Amino acid sequence: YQLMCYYTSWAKDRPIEGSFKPGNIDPCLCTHLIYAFAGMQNNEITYTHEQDLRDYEALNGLKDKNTELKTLLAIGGWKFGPAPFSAMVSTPQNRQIFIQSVIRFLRQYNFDGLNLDWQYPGSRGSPPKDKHLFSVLVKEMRKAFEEESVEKDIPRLLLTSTGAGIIDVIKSGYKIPELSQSLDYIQVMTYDLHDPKDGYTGENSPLYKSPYDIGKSADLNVDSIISYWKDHGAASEKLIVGFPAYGHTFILSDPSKTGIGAPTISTGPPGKYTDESGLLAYYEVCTFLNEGATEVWDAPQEVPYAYQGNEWVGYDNVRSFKLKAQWLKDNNLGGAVVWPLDMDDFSGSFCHQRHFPLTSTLKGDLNIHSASC
């Protein structure tokens, strides 16, 4: 099994006790470290900031401590959106400029591969033709990496992509059989399944549907999402299940109605460290519980939730990570990806469950072993 771990460039900019630097990642904790995010300029991959280069040296220097460790560079993300990718895949010339820039950039900065994180081909403004063009990009990039490997006699660069977790988005953006042929891994985005627009409390990443979920809401869970990817042709061993190290918050309409599917008014207030309305890092949820929130385990979805007054949070803990790890081995999946590693309790000071409680749970239950460690 693989245990991939995202490190976000903006984590070091948080208040000092909640900030995390790439050089402080345990080199033996994960099998792959993914740096989010690279930028794009003139159809070429580039760094978003000059300090990112210092982060690349620190992150890639962890490979001297674990010689089996692989590093990937992610490009895209939700805030980046689809427009730069739509323009880049539009012509063979633009795709070639991008592919050659990727090879030079990854080799220069000692990355082992690329994580395409287009959100998304075929939606958010990206036209229907991008479902085909993204597949053409992936196949051409895979071919170029194979040629580069043969010509330079070095191990081939890895090629991965995120895969949407929302069924409708999957249908309009992904040629699953073709992508599974050319990609080494697909990081399935089995998170942000809280459906904030519907007006009810929902879990960020439930393993199974709630007995009250109806229609498309009954597909907002790990089991349904991964089953859709496999039923439509993705290689089980190439699927990397997304494990969020955070939860989503809500303001309850009635502090007496605190279950899953309870009426809500809005997103909850931002946490002190992550500063994003509707989100709390796992370490911030630990503070929420420590200061008095009522913790509930939801067995039908196999995830926890917590509330205090009118604030409600749906999240993942050690038990939900353990149950999902057992489910992923039972389903013959390729492994897991922690999103983002910087929201797990990296210091051990917020949760009192040692360093990286969520990620360490996966390291143990997925039998992660490196001869270098």
Residue numbers in the entry: 1 to 373
Task: Please give the exact wording used by the authors of the publication that reports this structure.
Although mice do not encode Gal10 in their genome, they do form pseudo-CLCs, made from the chitinase-like proteins Ym1 and/or Ym2, encoded by Chil3 and Chil4 and made by myeloid and epithelial cells respectively. Ym1 (encoded by the Chil3 gene) and Ym2 (encoded by the Chil4 gene) are CLPs belonging to the glycoside hydrolase family 18 (GH18) and are unique to mice, with no known human orthologues. However, Ym1 is mainly expressed by macrophages, neutrophils and a subset of circulating pro-repair monocytes, while Ym2 is produced by lung epithelial cells, which could have discrete context dependent benefits. Ym1 and Ym2 are among the most strongly induced proteins in the airways of mice after allergen exposure and both proteins readily form pseudo-CLCs in vivo.
In parallel, we produced recombinant Ym1 and Ym2 protein in FreeStyle 293 F cells. Spontaneous crystallization was aided by low pH and low temperature (4 °C). We produced recombinant Ym1 crystals which were shown to have identical crystal packing and structure by X-ray crystallography as in vivo native crystals derived from murine lung. Native in vivo isolated Ym1 crystals and recombinant Ym1 crystals as well as native in vivo isolated Ym2 crystals and recombinant Ym2 crystals were crystallographically equivalent, sharing the same monoclinic space group (P21) and unit-cell parameters. Thus, recombinant Ym1 and Ym2 protein crystals can be generated in vitro and are biosimilar to native Ym1 and Ym2 crystals. (C–E) Structural superposition of the X-ray structures determined from a native in vivo grown Ym1 crystal isolated from the BAL fluid of mev/mev mice (C+E) (yellow), a native in vivo grown Ym2 crystal isolated from the BAL fluid of a C57BL/6J-Tg(CAG-Gal10)Bla mouse (D+E) (blue) and a recombinant Ym1 (C) and Ym2 (D) crystal (grey). The low root-mean-square deviations (RMSDs) establish structural similarity. When administered to the airways of mice, crystalline but not soluble Ym1 stimulated innate and adaptive immunity and acted as a type 2 immune adjuvant for eosinophilic inflammation via triggering of dendritic cells (DCs). Thus, the induction of allergic type 2 inflammation was specifically related to the crystalline state of Ym1.
